[PDB]
């Protein structure tokens, strides 16, 4: 998680998306969803990230629709974001034993329980926090099974970013399980 603001630029694909929704929380705005393949995608745009600017008009305040309307009406050819880092979550870093375990239960991508002597107790993991991404990959709307074969397929050191369930809970609904574990952006990042 990079601490303060950049800035990013896309340009409108062919069809007039960028592959963005976006939400209202706390009088700011915040990422609900990147589409893979997308403009937003491809100059790494993550769940979570806050839009500080579009265009340098400041979002505080806006509604998700006021802020999906004044991207629907911008020229296509170059929208500057001015974006904060994921602000609501947290990096950790765990190591797995020689079991290959890191040390925790989930249940529909949120931690439940820490075991003891783990990684995930030597490092402070906590219960009641989501799971939006591991080592970079966002898995938001995967199946607990295929969450648990990310990690088998992770090697010794992983990185989970979690969010507290309570505030992920409020940016992802009024958006369909389905969405989310179809269209959501699950995709290593390129270079």
Known sequence: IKQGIREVILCKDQD?????RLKSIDNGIFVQLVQANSPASLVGLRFGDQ???????????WSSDKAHKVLK????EKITMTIRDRPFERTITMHK???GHVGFIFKNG????????????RNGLLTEHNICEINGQNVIG???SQIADILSTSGTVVTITIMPAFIFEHIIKRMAP?????????????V
């Open 142 to 144: 995967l199946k607990d």
């Open 73 to 76: 009406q911008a020229f296509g």
């Open 51 to 61: 839009v500080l600017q579009i265009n340098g008009e400041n979002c505080a305040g």
């Open 97 to 99: 034993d020689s079991t």
């Open 110 to 121: 949120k931690i439940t329980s820490i075991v003891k002597d783990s990684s995930a107790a």
């Open 178 to 190: 389905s969405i989310m574990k179809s269209l959501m952006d699950h995709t290593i990042p390129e």
């Open 16 to 20: 007039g998306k960028i592959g963005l």
